[PDB]
Design a protein around this ligand. Structure first.
Ligand code: HEM
Ligand SMILES: CC[C@H]1OC(=O)[C@H](C)[C@@H](O[C@H]2O[C@@H](C)C[C@@H](N(C)C)[C@@H]2O)[C@@H](C)C[C@H](C)C(=O)/C=C/[C@H]1C
Length: 393
């Protein structure tokens, strides 16, 4: 057991060395994370990539000796927290809507907005702004709302909840926050019902209404949840981490400056260097697994430490180097195997459109700050700044 709350923000800020340390000793290690939780950590690209889609590791709480709370299980009815089948019926209901193709239509809007967002920000006399409260957050929370059909006056309560889940002032807010969403969202599910809305949510109400055997009132809720969430506190951070990455390394930022074709590649490398997902989501071996000696026993929670997998000197030699030339082919910033991210299509869309914006409508764009002044979330699942200021001139 290696405590993580005790390691400090230092770990948060730069936990890569520890990951190194860990991998060098073995594939798996039981550790305590910042919130009293005593979990497992899988490290190393080779060992991790395997785990992610290894049958033996379940994502269904029933294969977990760790109990859920009313707040919890009232929402775990999502494709992501289900194993096959089920995860087959659920994901096979939104698939057709998140394909690279379909998704591309959303573009003009993931355009219309990334400009409006950029405009208010450019309304800084001083020249300074915290990209986080300007782009990063705003963007992701708009597109999805305008998709799962989320009223404007409520797109705020969400940033409120997402926070408490990420790193709550105290491991209690989250349990209350879950109630809210679980409630605001159920109340939302009704507004739709009856109306003739065309958004994805409305679209998911007629499916439960018609045949609740295809989608349950619970899975509908589950669904609505995992879609809003599982892509809000991930996109936002890729955005920020992406800017802190591209702003810190001038050789590249200048490269991508003159040439803007390295954009589609800039993003893929902003996910290999430091993507928003520090570690995969909870996995439970249905039966005791044997990762060469280290034996995680039944029901135990597991986390694939992506951030380390993504820094394997054997697949990304010179790991700690951020080269938008680098061959990002092989990164697991989106997961792998059946549970792979159903949003990579949508995600990238927003990202690339964004960097282009900020780089094309922000002259002397630069870090209006120093590393020593950053602040990263302690959670070992995420990896993002609490805020990130910039200046343009
Ligand atoms: C760029 C930001 C994003 C990142 C880094 C990301 C990454 C991932 C990863 C790693 C998983 C793997 C889960 C696991 O195996 O533990 C996942 C699953 C998923 N993500 Fe994302 N995601 C992003 C954006 C999106 C967006 C915009 C949506 C919006 C709907 C989305 C919805 C979900 C859902 C619902 C799954 C379920 C996959 C399944 O069980 O079939 N993701 N994501
Ligand atoms: C998609 C990558 C991010 O993962 C999430 O969105 C995870 C799945 C999400 O987990 C929990 O969300 C609750 C609202 C419901 C709960 N379940 C028990 C009913 C589910 O496990 C995040 C909100 C949790 C973590 C802290 C996070 O912020 C994001 C992590 C990414 C890896």
């Amino acid at each position: 057991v290696l405590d993580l709350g005790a390691l400090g923000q230092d770990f948060a800020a730069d936990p890569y060395p520890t990951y190194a340390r860990l991998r060098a000793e073995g594939p798996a290690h039981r550790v305590r994370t910042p919130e009293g939780d005593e979990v497992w950590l899988v490290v190393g690209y080779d060992r991790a990539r395997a785990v992610l889609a290894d049958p033996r590791f379940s994502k269904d709480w029933r294969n977990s000796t760790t109990p859920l709370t009313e707040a919890e299980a009232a929402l775990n009815h999502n494709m992501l927290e289900s194993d096959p089948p089920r995860h087959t019926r659920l994901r096979k209901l939104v698939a057709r809507e998140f394909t690279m193709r379909r998704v591309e239509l959303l573009r003009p809007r993931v355009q219309e907005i990334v400009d409006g967002l950029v405009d208010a920000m450019l309304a800084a006399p001083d020249g300074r702004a915290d990209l986080m409260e300007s782009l990063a957050w705003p963007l992701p929370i708009t597109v999805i709302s305008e998709l799962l059909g989320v009223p404007e006056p409520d797109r705020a309560a969400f940033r409120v909840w997402t926070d408490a889940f990420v790193f709550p002032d105290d491991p209690a807010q989250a349990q209350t926050a879950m109630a809210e969403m679980s409630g605001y969202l159920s109340r939302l599910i009704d507004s739709k019902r009856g109306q003739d809305g065309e958004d994805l949510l409305s679209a998911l109400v007629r499916t439960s209404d018609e045949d609740g055997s295809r989608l349950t009132s619970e899975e509908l809720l589950g669904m609505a949840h995992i879609l809003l969430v599982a892509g809000h506190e991930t996109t936002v951070n890729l955005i920020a981490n992406g800017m802190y990455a591209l702003l810190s390394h001038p050789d590249q930022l200048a490269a991508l400056r003159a040439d803007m074709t390295l954009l589609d590649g800039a993003v893929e490398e902003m996910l290999r260097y430091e993507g928003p997902v520090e570690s995969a989501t909870y996995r439970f071996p249905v039966e005791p697994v044997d990762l060469d000696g280290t034996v995680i026993p039944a029901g135990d929670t597991v986390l694939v430490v992506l951030a380390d997998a993504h820094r394997t000197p054997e697949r990304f030699p010179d790991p700690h180097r951020f080269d938008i030339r680098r061959d990002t082919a092989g990164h697991l910033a989106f997961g792998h195997g059946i549970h792979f991210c159903i949003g990579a299509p949508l995600a990238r869309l927003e990202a690339r459109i964004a960097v282009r914006a900020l780089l094309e409508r922000c002259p002397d764009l630069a870090l209006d700050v120093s590393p020593g002044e950053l602040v990263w979330y302690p959670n070992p699942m995420i990896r993002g700044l609490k805020a990130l200021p910039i200046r343009w001139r």
